[PDB]
Write an enzyme that holds these catalytic residues in place. Structure first.
Site, mmCIF file in Angstrom:
data_model
loop_
_atom_site.group_PDB
_atom_site.id
_atom_site.type_symbol
_atom_site.label_atom_id
_atom_site.label_comp_id
_atom_site.label_asym_id
_atom_site.label_seq_id
_atom_site.Cartn_x
_atom_site.Cartn_y
_atom_site.Cartn_z
ATOM 1 N N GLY A 1 0.918 -1.048 0.095
ATOM 2 C CA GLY A 1 -0.110 0.192 0.015
ATOM 3 C C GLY A 1 1.004 1.064 -0.036
ATOM 4 O O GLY A 1 2.044 1.158 0.543
ATOM 5 N N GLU A 2 0.175 2.109 -0.576
ATOM 6 C CA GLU A 2 0.935 3.674 -0.640
ATOM 7 C C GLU A 2 -0.041 4.672 -0.234
ATOM 8 O O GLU A 2 -1.124 4.514 -0.297
ATOM 9 C CB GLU A 2 1.478 3.937 -2.092
ATOM 10 C CG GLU A 2 2.738 4.992 -2.247
ATOM 11 C CD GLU A 2 1.895 6.397 -2.229
ATOM 12 O OE1 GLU A 2 0.687 6.484 -2.271
ATOM 13 O OE2 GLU A 2 2.836 7.374 -2.239
ATOM 14 N N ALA B 1 0.872 7.024 5.364
ATOM 15 C CA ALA B 1 1.545 5.768 5.525
ATOM 16 C C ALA B 1 1.734 5.039 4.386
ATOM 17 O O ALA B 1 1.237 5.132 3.495
ATOM 18 C CB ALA B 1 0.940 4.740 6.566
ATOM 19 N N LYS C 1 4.136 -0.813 8.493
ATOM 20 C CA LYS C 1 3.404 0.450 8.153
ATOM 21 C C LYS C 1 4.485 1.486 8.597
ATOM 22 O O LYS C 1 4.618 1.699 9.656
ATOM 23 C CB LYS C 1 2.043 0.800 9.066
ATOM 24 C CG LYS C 1 1.366 2.193 8.610
ATOM 25 C CD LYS C 1 0.088 2.414 9.340
ATOM 26 C CE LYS C 1 -1.156 1.423 9.128
ATOM 27 N NZ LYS C 1 -2.069 2.168 10.036
ATOM 28 N N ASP D 1 -14.466 5.368 15.625
ATOM 29 C CA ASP D 1 -14.633 5.315 14.166
ATOM 30 C C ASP D 1 -14.747 3.878 13.468
ATOM 31 O O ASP D 1 -14.039 3.525 12.526
ATOM 32 C CB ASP D 1 -13.140 5.766 13.340
ATOM 33 C CG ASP D 1 -13.371 6.108 11.933
ATOM 34 O OD1 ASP D 1 -14.515 6.235 11.364
ATOM 35 O OD2 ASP D 1 -12.146 6.381 11.506
#
Lengths: 66, 312, 322
Positions: free
Chosen positions: C22-23, C27, C45, C143
């Site tokens: 992930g980009e 993070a 991360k 959340d």
């Protein structure tokens, strides 16, 4: 077992209904605290835990034994 | 094998920041000795200066921990913030030496990061205002440094709420007097607000243990009553009482009345100022300026071997 | 050369960084695995400590670092394995590797992913234990939503994003009303409440429960007035009768339409009947307007829905992403 074997049951203390502190009385009748859903039971439970959490935790002896 | 004790031993405060007094001294002495060796090696690149003694190092930490609390009081910060900021300060300077990073600056950083750790995220510009600091970047430069120093342990456990919990358990007794209870709580709170933050109480005792000790100093009868009752309804009772008594003695050496001792102009000039001058000539030359330390570490990460400003 | 600096490098050596899964500006996520056991996988991360924030370390970073360590140990909370600082003064979180995605993508995958009531009961059991464990440790998540419910390789669901979490405030300590994604925000927070409790999280669970049953958001309002109107339409208009003092909240607002009486359990059966009477009983208790009469997480775990047939699906048999 609904709590997945993680249920916390205190050993040396019990949070009963009679526990209260006059400093709380001011807020229990605050409109914003009651109508907003502030839990005073959770606060009492939070204080009682911290008051007894680690009462028999002897840091010096336990750490030197390792 | 109490269940509340087992859950406490899983906290970072216990596994990472709880030691025996012998372990605490060895860490502080080795941190000072290693810093002494590191600064000495750098200087050669030939009269070396006088480096601070571990006791003189610990003395400045105690002086600036009291100044940190005073600064918190003037800014009307919450008790939980003060205690967390002070603890971060003490934890920072046990893994790090006072001769490496400036305690005058880390004092403000511990207060700013203590707010965040307790759910208060103010604007750095407003934070600098309250402390008459013109450039806020001087405070941010140490924020991440402090985070590493405390080993990323942000959950600090305080005995303030434990005190109010202990009073309710006593309020259930019919023989105890309310006016007596109020006086005990009032004093025990002032003790908790200063005594265990300026001494090594947190490192050797549990918030419950410290809390009972501050109450034992305010009203020994109430403290003994509470311990007797819970164990009434063994050998562990005597070991707990012995532990509280050990904490009771540690706290007594720095009672709230000592607030004026660490703010005294004569104590400063006689005991503190000499040490600050010894520190001013043996400090680390590269790390003392946090803003510069941050500048070169950002440029080192961006530009690897690319440079157009180097003259040799 | 610092003793703490080499200790951090020793900890970074424990985990070998791999593919970039992930980009992002906040993070970057990388696949990793222990050097001592390359079969033990891990997710790293890399929090960019400098992410367009002029006030130092971001609150989502501070909160995650604090509460993920505090809650560590429960099977339905994402495990923080380790923390170390990078050479570029960046923060790195070594987290549980959860390759099966999250619950939002399963719910959205209407064409290929098939799940039934027994699977809903299995997922809800995991979520309820997670929120129960949070409140058991005096932590509000604030959340909860499907895409913050990550799924482990064995099928166990883990609560993940704690960037908005906060410890239980003391009496008189004001809290922010701007938490929880709108579609899952309880009415007391929509009204600007500053002194709330765990009930705010239970409401979000109720919306995740409802979203699972209909495979679409229950009340997807685009504005706070739409969210307020939607709750009035589908749950009931909060009034001084059912919620004393509600009209005194800092930001109380009402669409000024004919008030809608609060719907009872029976009214929910038609749309959410897939989980049965006992299931809709639980759903209805989580969506009580007045947070004081809203069910708690502990009460939720002792409800009859879990022990009523059909028994929940075993995590090894739960649906996987395509």
């Amino acid at each position: 077992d609904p709590f997945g074997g993680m249920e916390f049951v205190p050993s040396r203390y019990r949070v009963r209904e009679e526990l209260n502190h006059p400093s709380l009385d001011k807020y229990r009748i605050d409109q914003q605290h009651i109508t907003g859903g502030y839990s005073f039971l959770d606060y009492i439970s939070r204080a009682m835990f911290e008051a007894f959490a680690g009462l028999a935790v002897f840091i010096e002896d336990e750490k030197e034994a390792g | 094998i109490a269940s509340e004790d087992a859950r406490y031993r899983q906290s970072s405060q216990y596994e990472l920041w709880s030691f025996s007094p012998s372990q605490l001294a060895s860490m502080r002495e080795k941190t000072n000795a290693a810093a002494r060796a590191r600064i000495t090696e750098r200087l050669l690149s030939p009269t070396l200066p006088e480096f601070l003694t571990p006791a003189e190092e610990l003395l400045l930490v105690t002086f600036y921990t009291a100044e940190l609390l005073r600064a918190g009081d003037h800014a009307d910060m919450s008790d939980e913030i003060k205690a967390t900021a002070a603890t971060f300060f003490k934890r920072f300077y046990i893994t790090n030496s006072i001769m490496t990073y400036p305690p005058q600056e880390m004092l403000l950083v511990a207060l700013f990061f203590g707010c965040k750790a307790e759910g208060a995220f103010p604007s750095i510009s407003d934070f600098a205002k309250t402390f008459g600091r013109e450039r806020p970047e001087e405070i941010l430069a140490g924020e991440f440094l402090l985070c590493q120093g405390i080993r990323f342990a942000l959950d600090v456990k305080h005995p303030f709420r434990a005190l109010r919990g202990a009073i309710m358990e006593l309020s259930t007794l019919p023989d105890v007097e309310p006016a007596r209870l109020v006086a005990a709580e009032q004093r025990a709170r002032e003790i908790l607000r200063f005594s265990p933050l300026i001494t090594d109480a947190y490192f050797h005792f549990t918030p419950s243990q410290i809390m009972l000790a501050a109450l034992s100093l305010a009203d020994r009868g109430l403290a003994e009553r509470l311990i007797q009752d819970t164990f009434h309804y063994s050998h562990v009772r005597d070991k707990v009482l012995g532990t509280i008594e050990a904490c009771r003695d540690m706290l007594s050496k720095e009672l709230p009345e000592r607030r004026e001792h660490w703010n005294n102009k004569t104590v400063y000039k006689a005991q503190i100022q000499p040490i600050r001058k010894k520190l001013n000539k043996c400090r680390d030359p590269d790390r003392w300026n946090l803003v510069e330390l941050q500048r070169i570490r950002r440029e080192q990460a961006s530009r690897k071997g690319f440079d157009s400003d180097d003259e040799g | 050369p610092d003793p703490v600096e080499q200790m951090n490098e020793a900890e970074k050596r424990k985990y070998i960084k791999g593919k970039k899964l992930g980009e992002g500006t906040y993070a970057n996520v990388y696949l990793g695995h222990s050097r001592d056991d390359p079969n033990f996988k891990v997710a790293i991360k890399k929090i960019k400590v400098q992410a367009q924030y002029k006030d130092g370390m971001a609150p989502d970073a501070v909160r995650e670092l604090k509460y993920l360590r505090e809650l560590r140990g429960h099977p339905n909370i994402i495990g923080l394995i380790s923390v170390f600082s990078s050479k570029d003064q960046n923060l790195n979180l070594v987290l549980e590797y959860l390759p099966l995605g999250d619950l939002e993508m399963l719910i959205r995958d209407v064409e290929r992913v098939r799940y039934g009531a027994a699977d809903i009961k299995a997922w809800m059991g995991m979520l309820t234990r997670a929120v129960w464990w949070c409140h058991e440790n005096f932590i509000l998540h604030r959340d909860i939503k499907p895409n913050n419910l990550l799924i482990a390789a064995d099928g166990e669901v883990k609560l993940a994003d704690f960037g908005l979490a906060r410890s239980f405030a003391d009496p008189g300590r004001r809290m922010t009303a701007n938490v929880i994604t709108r579609w899952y925000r309880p009415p007391e927070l929509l009204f600007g409440a500053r002194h709330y409790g765990g009930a705010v999280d239970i409401w979000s669970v109720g919306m995740v429960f409802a979203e699972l049953i209909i495979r679409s958001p229950f009340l997807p309002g685009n504005t706070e007035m739409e969210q307020i109107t939607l709750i009035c339409k589908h749950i009931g208009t909060p009034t001084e009768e059912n919620w004393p003092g509600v009209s005194k909240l800092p930001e109380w607002w009402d669409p000024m339409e004919e008030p809608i009486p609060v719907w009872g359990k029976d009214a929910y059966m038609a749309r959410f009947g897939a989980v049965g009477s006992e299931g809709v009983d639980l759903l209805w208790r989580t969506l009580q307007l007045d947070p004081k009469k809203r069910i708690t997480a502990r009460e939720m775990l002792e409800h009859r829905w879990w022990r009523t047939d059909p028994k929940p699906t075993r995590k090894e048999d739960l649906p996987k992403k395509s």
